[PDB]
């Protein structure tokens, strides 16, 4: 996080990270290990705790029966971490049920006790330095902040010395604004984690680079060629969504708005919110009234996954996109958005033939109105790719999965592990 990049002043942003020499596209600009992190538990039984190496026949923690490791090396690094939750583990049951918000913030008070001097992974932004927004939170978040607080007193009293009420709630503003998830090949959650130094980049909607994870390690790679001098940007955002939209997700977190070329021309607002050619052009109150809907759509739609079930998620997506098909095209985003949501539901009870037809009606407009090498896209054609296999449809399979692999192999790197793992699925 050093070598041929400088923390600098980035104007009207903030603290920024700027290049000092070349990087051409696939470049690693830099990597950084994780400061802190936690494994989510519904990925427990498939990845290692201390790695998050997936494998087959990974080694259970004998004192808690709950963790696992690849071997004893992993179990014993990863004990001064594990610790905080083996115990409570055994001793709460089905009852412990700390958020991953608090599973990590644990973690960092544990990190800060055992180092607490600089790491590696702070050589430009250190963890005490990061933005709260504390004075910006409204009543709900902060109320919710005091509940992890609550629940982290409650589920690990006898393995921390806790910091004043006053200092918990900065830190879990913190947590709650700076903390990463780590995605697999599919972009399925693994976990949560603090990456100091990858905190430092501001955001751009036409950003420059991308974060991708080598087990821990945060990866970042550039997605477009970067000057010496130039500013690198990072996307904090789901770059699908028209410029309000965008706009709207970073004040909610962030508390920011964005001013790149994206957001100050909206050139490609039209593309993304793309109109059908009917005889009468609809009007603004028409697309302002469908735009809300849909928005509103995919919000429902988000908190009816958790208790809805899935004949009738699939039912929301459907009369979803017959209502906004009066006024958009299929390859409108929030269209794409319902049925990428549909495609979840199929692969989810197993219909593989159903998510194969969404995944090939997404795909292509998918791929133009997201950056080249989105993981989101990456993601996509990786699914596909083994769909198509798993019903052997091999040219379509071996066409699916190399799609999956340009995109990664600059994303991730060449030699990355996701990647040698889709080449044995080809060589297959
Ligand atoms: C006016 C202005 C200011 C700008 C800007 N760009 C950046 N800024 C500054 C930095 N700002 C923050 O308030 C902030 C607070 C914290 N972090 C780091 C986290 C971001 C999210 N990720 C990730 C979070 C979750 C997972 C999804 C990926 C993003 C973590 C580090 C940044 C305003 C710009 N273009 N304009
Ligand atoms: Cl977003
Ligand atoms: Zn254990
Ligand atoms: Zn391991
Ligand atoms: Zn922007």
């Known amino acids: 996080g050093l070598g041929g990049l400088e923390r600098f002043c980035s104007p009207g942003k903030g603290r920024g990270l700027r290049a000092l020499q070349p990087f051409?596209?696939?470049?690693?600009?830099?990597?950084?290990?994780?400061?802190?992190?936690?494994?989510?538990?519904?990925?427990?039984?498939?990845?290692?705790?201390?790695?998050?190496?997936?494998?087959?026949?990974?080694?259970?923690?004998?004192?808690?029966?709950?963790?696992?490791?690849?071997?004893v090396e992993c179990q014993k690094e990863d004990w001064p971490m594990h610790k905080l939750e083996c115990s409570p583990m055994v001793v709460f049951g089905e009852n412990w049920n700390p958020s991953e918000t608090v599973r990590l913030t644990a973690r960092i008070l544990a990190k800060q006790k055992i180092h607490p001097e600089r790491t590696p992974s702070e050589k430009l932004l250190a963890v005490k330095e990061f933005e709260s927004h504390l004075d910006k939170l409204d009543n709900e978040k902060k109320d919710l902040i005091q509940s992890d607080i609550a629940a982290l007193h409650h589920f690990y009293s006898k393995h921390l010395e806790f910091p004043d009420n006053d200092s918990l709630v900065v830190l879990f503003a913190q947590v709650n604004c700076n903390g990463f998830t780590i995605e697999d090949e599919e972009l399925?959650?693994?976990?949560?984690?603090?990456?100091?130094?990858?905190?430092?980049?501001?955001?751009?909607?036409?950003?420059?680079?991308?974060?991708?994870?080598?087990?821990?390690?945060?990866?970042?790679?550039?997605?477009?060629?970067?000057?010496?001098?130039?500013?690198?940007?990072?996307?904090?955002?789901?770059?699908?969504?028209?410029?309000?939209?965008?706009?709207?997700?970073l004040r909610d977190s962030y508390f920011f708005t964005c001013e790149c070329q994206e957001c100050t021309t909206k050139d490609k607002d039209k593309a993304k919110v793309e109109i059908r050619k009917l005889s009468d052009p609809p009007k603004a109150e028409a697309i302002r009234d469908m735009v809300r809907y849909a928005r509103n759509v995919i919000e429902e739609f988000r908190r009816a996954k958790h208790y809805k079930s899935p004949s009738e998620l699939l039912e929301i997506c459907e009369l979803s996109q017959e209502k906004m098909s009066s006024v958009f095209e299929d390859s409108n985003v929030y269209m794409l958005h319902?049925?990428?949501?549909?495609?979840?539901?199929?692969?989810?009870?197993?219909?593989?033939?159903?998510?194969?037809?969404?995944?090939?009606?997404?795909?292509?407009?998918?791929?133009?109105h997201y950056p080249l090498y989105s993981l989101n896209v990456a993601s996509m054609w990786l699914k596909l790719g083994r769909l198509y296999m798993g019903l052997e449809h091999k040219a379509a399979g071996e066409k699916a999965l190399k799609k999956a692999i340009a995109i990664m192999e600059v994303a991730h790197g060449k030699d990355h592990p996701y990647i040698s793992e889709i080449k044995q699925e080809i060589e297959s």
Request: proline share 4%; glycine share 8%; charged share 20%.
């Open 188 to 249: 399925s959650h693994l976990g949560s984690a603090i990456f100091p130094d990858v905190a430092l980049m501001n955001h751009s909607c036409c950003p420059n680079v991308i974060v991708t994870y080598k087990g821990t390690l945060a990866e970042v790679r550039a997605v477009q060629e970067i000057k010496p001098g130039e500013e690198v940007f990072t996307s904090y955002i789901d770059l699908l969504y028209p410029t309000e939209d965008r706009n709207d997700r």
């Open 338 to 368: 319902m049925m990428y949501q549909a495609m979840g539901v199929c692969l989810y009870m197993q219909d593989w033939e159903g998510a194969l037809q969404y995944g090939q009606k997404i795909i292509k407009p998918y791929s133009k």
């Open 24 to 71: 051409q596209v696939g470049d690693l600009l830099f990597s950084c290990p994780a400061y802190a992190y936690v494994l989510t538990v519904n990925e427990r039984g498939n990845h290692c705790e201390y790695c998050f190496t997936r494998k087959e026949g990974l080694s259970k923690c004998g004192r808690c029966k709950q963790a696992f490791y690849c071997n």
